[PDB]
Structures are given as structure tokens and as C-alpha cells.
Design an enzyme around this catalytic site. Structure first.
Site, PDB file in Angstrom:
ATOM      1  N   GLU A 174      11.551   5.847   5.582  1.00  0.00           N
ATOM      2  CA  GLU A 174      10.143   6.187   5.721  1.00  0.00           C
ATOM      3  C   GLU A 174       9.959   7.484   4.951  1.00  0.00           C
ATOM      4  OE1 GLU A 174       7.706   4.521   7.194  1.00  0.00           O
ATOM      5  OE2 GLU A 174       8.933   2.827   7.855  1.00  0.00           O
ATOM      6  N   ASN A 179       7.323  -7.700   6.641  1.00  0.00           N
ATOM      7  CA  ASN A 179       8.316  -6.981   7.433  1.00  0.00           C
ATOM      8  C   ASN A 179       8.356  -7.517   8.846  1.00  0.00           C
ATOM      9  OD1 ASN A 179      10.468  -5.265   7.235  1.00  0.00           O
ATOM     10  ND2 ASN A 179       9.374  -3.423   7.854  1.00  0.00           N
ATOM     11  N   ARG A 204      -1.574  -4.254   2.971  1.00  0.00           N
ATOM     12  CA  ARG A 204      -0.119  -4.169   3.138  1.00  0.00           C
ATOM     13  C   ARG A 204       0.586  -5.525   3.135  1.00  0.00           C
ATOM     14  NH1 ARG A 204       0.865  -3.511   9.496  1.00  0.00           N
ATOM     15  NH2 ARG A 204       3.062  -3.390   8.803  1.00  0.00           N
ATOM     16  N   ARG A 212       0.810  -1.218   0.000  1.00  0.00           N
ATOM     17  CA  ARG A 212       0.000   0.000   0.000  1.00  0.00           C
ATOM     18  C   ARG A 212       0.845   1.269   0.000  1.00  0.00           C
ATOM     19  NH1 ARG A 212      -2.737  -0.214   6.064  1.00  0.00           N
ATOM     20  NH2 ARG A 212      -1.010   0.503   7.282  1.00  0.00           N
ATOM     21  N   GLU A 213       2.153   1.109   0.247  1.00  0.00           N
ATOM     22  CA  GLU A 213       3.045   2.263   0.219  1.00  0.00           C
ATOM     23  C   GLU A 213       3.536   2.597  -1.189  1.00  0.00           C
ATOM     24  OE1 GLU A 213       4.467   0.941   4.536  1.00  0.00           O
ATOM     25  OE2 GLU A 213       6.016   1.003   2.858  1.00  0.00           O
ATOM     26  N   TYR A 219       8.163   2.015  17.672  1.00  0.00           N
ATOM     27  CA  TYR A 219       7.749   1.056  18.696  1.00  0.00           C
ATOM     28  C   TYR A 219       8.451  -0.286  18.460  1.00  0.00           C
ATOM     29  CZ  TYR A 219       4.584  -0.484  22.443  1.00  0.00           C
ATOM     30  OH  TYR A 219       4.054  -0.849  23.660  1.00  0.00           O
TER      31      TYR A 219
END
Ligand SMILES: [Zn+2]
Length: 409
Positions: free
Chosen positions: A365, A237, A218, A166-167, A343
Site C-alpha cells: 500500500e 482483488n 477501480r 485508479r491507483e 478489515y
């Protein structure tokens, strides 16, 4: 029409660490789509279904956690992106041998493009199939070199995108790198002294699925993980061998499902095999994601590697190079450890690559580009497509040269 009719985007604002844990576990047990984690000083975003909106904000209210409604129906934002991308594709002069930077390209177009490049530039470009995706789709990558990977004195720089399908803004970035190393070579040092591995579409099944269906998907498309396949797909990931299963979900219905075991998915396995073949001289590894405007490293668990100081230093150099050419509307890049900035996470690609090969390994990112309608998210505005590529390439070449200059190790 859509599975997102009624879905709302919330912004959760946490005051202390006690709430960071509170909100995090709640999101997980409710199996929500967490776009960005909440932390004191930088509120996170979460996509909440229509049939869970009342329960969700009920808990935050009784917990004392601030929140507030950003988008009441994400369907309208999705429909606009389609409208904006459809018009860009109509005006585009993009071709099979030359992908432009004025539209988003599908898996098929990228797959064909790679093969066309190896026909026109056979002395530097070599297209190779690393394997097949779960649904059988061919996953190929490039090996860019003037010495055909023969001179082992030259360092290797690996780069990949679309691990999280989705990125979409990640593909332009990796495509621009091919463009400057092959099509428009304005810097000869980067091709002569460095061997490159570029994998545009790391998750072809998911990417294709996001093109006609679940836009916000994703994970990959793996079945056989639940009866009748009510829930499917594994977060790639979280499927890598560096501390697998320690900081990820055990439910297949979650977006952070780690899978059966480390490298249980074919998509992650093929990446492993590429890393292994070139681990003898891999200097830099980059896993390009979206969304955050940050360059992270470490190890998701909080423990820092021996060359931490060196990792952060090169990260800052790449960040400053991107911030020097950024859009005034966009914010400056953050640098730091994965656990510290975001996180706890495990099974990440950059962490594994660091453990088995590259002395320097980051997870990028890319910036969330804002406009009149949407703010921070995964939706792409065709006006940022080229800038997304150009901006990132500034950081990448600075990193590649700096990481390669670690021939003092
Ligand atoms: Zn991601």
C-alpha cells in the site's frame, strides 16, 4: 461535465469496534466508495455522492459516529490533477523506448515500451502476452533473466501493479523496478541470482477508462452482470480463489463485487496462469496497491499462516528500508496482517499466491502524497513520481534478497 460534480469526501472517526461494524455495513448498503476503512485510532475516508450526503450524515448523527467534511466537491481536485499532469507531460522528454519518471504513462505507452525493451535487451528481457482483457486489450508482462528462466535453481520474484486501475501511483513503482533491472543496472546480484516477472498494467480496460472518464474507477469493465448494464465491473482483488466470496459484495453495483465465481474475469485468470507456471520456484510475490503506507500479509480472514513470524520479519525489513529514504512529509510504514490492520477481505491476489506458490507474499500500500490542495487520496502530484518508484525499490530489493535467502526451506 463530470459524474463527480457535487461528490464530497468525508472522514469517519469511530471510537469502538461496535461502530466499525456499524459504519462498514452502512457504507455497503448505500454502495459508497470507501477509500479507507475506519478503525479506532485511524479514521477512514469515503466518497459520498451529492444525492446521498444528507442521508449519509443523518445516520452518523443518530449513531453517535464522528465525521467531518474534508472535500465538498472532488471535481476541483480532479481538474487540478489534470492540469498538473498535463503540464508535466508537455515538459517531459519521455520517449517510446525510455519512459521517464516525470509523468504518468498510459496503457498504450507502457505496452509499446515493453516491446521496445525486448528489442534492445534480448538476452535479459523477454516480453510475453499473458492474455487478453475483457474488452480484448493485450496484457503483456516482462520476464527478466540472464539465464532465460532456464536455470531452475534461481528463485522467482513476481511483481504487479494497477490491479485497481485508479491507483496510478503503483505504475511508477513497477516501472522503476524494470529501470534498475534493465536500463540502469547498478546491482548485479539482483539480476544474476534472481528471475523476475513484472506485470505493469494488470487492469488495462479500467486504467484506460480512468484516463478519460471515471477517474475513481477501480474495477474491470465486465458487462453481462445486469440488465442494460446499469452497473458493471468486478473487483479483481476479490476474484481470486483463496476463500472467494466469503468477505465481498454480491451486488454488481458495489465496488467490491466478487463476480460470478473465482477467476471469472480474464484479468485474474491470466495472473493465475502465470503463478501456476512458476509455482515450482516462486520465492516472493508482490501486489502493489495504493493507498495507506503499509505492507500486509496473512490471509484476509484473520487466520495466520505457518511462517507468520518470518513474513512479519521480512516485512519489517522492507519497511525500515523505505522509511530510511522517505519524504519528511510522509509517515512510516505499517506492517501486519490484512484482517488485523484493515478489515476482513477475501479473494485477494497475494492470498492466493501464498496458497498456491510463494512462501512469502505481500500486498503493498504505497503512500498517499499530500500537497497544498489535496491530502490523502489517489490523485498523483508529478513531483512524487520518481520518489514513489525509488522509495519502493529500496523495500523490494531488500525483500527479494531476504525472500530469496529462504533457500533454507
Ligand atoms: Zn487496491
Amino acid at each position: 461535465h463530470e459524474i463527480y460534480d457535487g461528490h464530497a469526501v468525508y472522514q469517519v472517526d469511530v471510537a469502538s469496534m461496535d461502530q466499525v461494524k456499524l459504519v462498514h455495513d452502512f457504507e455497503n448498503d448505500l454502495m459508497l466508495d470507501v477509500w479507507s476503512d475506519a478503525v479506532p485510532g485511524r479514521p477512514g475516508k469515503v466518497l459520498v455522492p451529492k444525492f446521498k450526503r444528507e442521508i449519509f450524515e443523518n445516520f452518523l448523527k443518530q449513531s453517535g459516529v464522528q465525521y467531518k467534511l474534508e472535500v465538498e466537491n472532488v471535481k476541483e481536485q480532479l481538474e487540478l490533477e489534470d492540469q498538473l499532469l498535463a503540464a508535466a507531460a508537455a515538459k517531459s522528454n519521455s520517449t517510446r523506448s525510455r519512459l521517464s519518471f516525470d509523468k504518468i504513462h498510459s496503457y498504450e505507452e507502457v505496452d509499446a515500451y515493453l516491446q521496445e525493451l525486448a528489442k534492445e535487451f534480448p538476452n535479459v528481457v523477454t516480453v510475453v502476452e499473458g492474455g487478453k482483457s475483457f474488452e480484448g486489450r493485450s496484457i503483456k508482462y516482462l520476464r527478466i533473466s540472464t539465464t532465460n528462466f532456464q536455470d531452475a535453481s534461481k528463485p522467482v520474484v513476481m511483481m504487479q501493479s494497477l490491479l485497481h486501475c485508479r491507483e496510478w501511483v503503483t505504475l511508477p513503482a513497477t516501472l522503476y523496478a524494470i529501470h534498475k533491472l534493465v536500463i540502469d543496472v547498478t546491482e548485479s546480484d539482483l539480476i544474476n541470482n534472481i528471475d523476475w516477472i513484472i506485470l505493469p498494467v494488470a487492469n488495462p480496460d479500467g486504467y484506460v477508462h480512468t484516463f478519460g472518464g471515471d477517474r475513481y474507477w477501480r474495477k474491470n469493465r465486465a458487462t453481462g452482470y445486469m440488465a442494460g448494464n446499469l452497473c458493471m465491473g468486478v473487483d479483481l482483488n476479490r476474484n481470486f480463489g483463496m476463500n472467494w466470496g466469503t468477505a465481498s459484495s454480491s451486488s454488481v453495483c458495489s465496488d467490491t463485487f466478487h463476480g460470478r465465481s473465482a477467476f471469472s474475469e480474464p484479468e485474474s485468470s491470466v495472473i493465475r496462469d502465470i503463478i501456476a507456471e512458476h509455482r515450482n520456484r516462486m520465492a516472493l510475490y508482490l501486489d502493489i496497491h495504493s493507498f495507506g503506507s503499509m505492507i500486509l500479509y496473512g490471509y484476509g480472514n484473520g487466520v495466520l499462516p505457518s511462517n507468520a513470524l518470518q513474513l512479519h520479519l521480512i516485512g519489517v525489513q522492507m519497511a525500515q528500508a523505505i522509511d530510511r529514504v522517505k519524504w519528511s512529509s510522509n509517515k512510516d510504514y505499517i506492517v501486519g496482517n490484512i484482517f488485523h490492520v484493515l478489515y476482513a477481505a477475501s479473494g485477494g491476489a497475494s492470498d492466493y499466491a501464498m496458497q498456491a506458490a510463494a512462501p512469502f507474499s505481500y500486498t503493498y500500500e504505497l503512500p498517499a502524497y499530500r500537497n497544498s490542495v489535496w491530502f490523502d487520496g489517489f490523485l498523483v502530484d508529478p513531483d512524487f513520481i520518481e520518489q514513489a518508484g525509488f522509495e519502493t525499490w529500496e523495500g523490494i530489493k531488500v525483500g527479494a534478497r531476504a525472500a530469496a535467502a529462504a533457500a533454507k526451506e
